[PDB]
Amino acid sequence: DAPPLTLEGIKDRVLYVLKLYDKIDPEKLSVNSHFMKDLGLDSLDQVEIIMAMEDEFGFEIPDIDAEKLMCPQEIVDYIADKKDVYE
């Protein structure tokens, strides 16, 4: 049981599995770029995205916190709060 975690590696993994999902564009997908406001995809597929991150990293995130992710940088904020991802 030794998983190593860091900031930019998990930023890479979150950004990677957002890039792999199809109906977004890989062109204008910044690190801090929104979900609803600029990409334009709706709420329901956003919660399917949240489902993808939960199914990847091995812990549920709650519905109280599921309202407010909205961009990949804030997602990396909340996951780094979960696993305490600093040195």
Partner: protein, 176 residues
Amino acid sequence: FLPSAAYLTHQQKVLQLYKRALRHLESRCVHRDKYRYFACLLRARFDEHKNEKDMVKATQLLREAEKEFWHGQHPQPYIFPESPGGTSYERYECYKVPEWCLDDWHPSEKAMYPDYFAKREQWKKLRRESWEREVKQLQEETPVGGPRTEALPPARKQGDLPPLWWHIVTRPRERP
């Protein structure tokens, strides 16, 4: 029943029903790709009348949705091993010692670890430095007599740390 809002909205309620049904269909359906098929079938069922704004017909459909969820739910939902009810669910709560303690040691054993206790002394000085004036004035000036929420405002005013941070900054590692 939630910190910021006094209650959950109906769009929020529809969304939580969506996540619950999708989770139990994960638990129901092995092999993961027929899962993917059935999940898009479920998403199609929510696409069937997604663009209607009869709020009373919407909550009628929501009641029948709760009925059709409870009819075919799964007995043991696949919950992750840090979730409530999970396989761990604060496994190492054994090894989670609070940080108000560790200072009731002996000065020999304190002298075995010099630098961490020197930096802990300057942390504690950071705590007592800006505890009274800024934090207490921001909590007895900017709130109303009835607070009416629980999200506390940050210290945007001038200087030091946002108020009441000790037992929230200083929580343990969740895997020691």
